[PDB]
């Protein structure tokens, strides 16, 4: 299958500095991207060019390191009924340049749309196994 | 691509007005059963006002309702299309006001009049961009 | 100088309750009167000087301070056939208050003035009759 | 009381900043200053920002009264939506039609390029309904 798209987002609170929440986000990009600011506001990034998607991903696994193995263990609970694989990153650490997973409720959300032929949960789960490695 | 998070349909009832008569001009816009919240407050001047709002939050209704509205409105939907940029505010809400009177008589007509039936529709897209938004709204005019 | 007549008209849109419209018109009649039903219009006309006189009195009474505003603009309110115009808040009227309104849905109140002859000069003077 | 009043507007590459400023004039019954700057538009294009700030209740109150006056029966539309025009920073938003403003007329606008008119609403007991009701007061 393939990765239809990649969506990265985060939330900015009243006591939070937007530029800072965006700096935390730029930590997940090895190339230029664009952030969309909306209104408590949202910072939203998207990836459609397969090149960038493919390049973003390989880079994310590289920066995750050993944590890339913990995704695998959870692929089943991470992928939803719309075949979107969800990966929660630590906002604060990312700000500090570090890429790490988090179970917290205010993470930098990374979402990937998976497409298999056809979209069979057993296929998507496997495409992701191969993917996270 | 995107969705209409919600839909709000409202009108005002003046001292000389009949709630039931108005509630009817409201229903002209609906092809299915619906509720109607009723608030009260002092109008622009000091006159006691009555507010009537109908909000659709079930995708189901939203879409059937929007298909209908477009159905009824018909040939004016092209005007909605050429004037999109002046109907959608910076909060991504699409605004459509109908002639309250012609409505009472089951006729949907866009109006610039001072006392119409306001129809807002929140449109949401990813990313949330004026661009992605206007593109979506332009689609809604199926 | 006399008031030939006095007629008070109002309108009722599809969404309006014709009765509530009329209960707002009666706010200016200190006596019996009938409504001529012609959206639809509602009219009333006074021909007896008594009523025409009772109407004008009670009118300025209710307007109060506002009676001075009219007193300001006669040349304008007075039309060609020496007919004087007063439009008032239909909404406040229904509540029981007379207020001139620039609004676009008033309760029009006009009355023809008659001078001898109806010279636009002496007519305006008679119009300023206010006290 | 009303903390501050700020009237801003945007200028696109193909627009005349003089014309845009004139349209802002339509809103003032007294002399004012326009503070220029740079920005991005809804489509990400290089824009010029024009803002006017009022702090003196003198000018403030005079402004609001006039504004309300010019608006006329249109203020009924504001009141029926009062909640939305109010953000969590307690600012009252009244969005004015730029083009009509330029043609010297004051009207509301539902589009995405108005002449923004914001108001910092302050209630001694400072709450949601506190300001929301205070808004009504300005009628």
Numbering used by the authors:
A (entry chain A): 4 to 42, 51 to 144
B (entry chain D): 3 to 144
C (entry chain C): 4 to 41, 51 to 143
D (entry chain B): 5 to 143
What does the paper say about this structure?
For 10077d from A. fulgidus, the N-terminal His6 tagged full length protein gave crystals and a structure, whereas the C-terminal His6 tagged version yielded neither. In none of the three X-ray structures of full-length UPF0201 proteins was electron density corresponding to the 15–20 C-terminal residues observed. The loop connecting β2 and β3 protrudes somewhat from the globular domain, and the electron density corresponding to this region is poorly defined in the 10077b and 10077d structures. Our four UPF0201 structures represent subfamilies N149845 (10077a, b) and N130963 (10077c, d). The crystallographic asymmetric units contain one protomer in 10077c, two in 10077b and four protomers in both 10077a and 10077d. While 10077a, 10077b and 10077d all form one type of dimer (typeI), 10077c forms altogether different dimer via crystallographic symmetry (typeII). The interface surface area for type I dimers in 10077a, 10077b and 10077d are 672, 563 and 611 Å2, respectively.
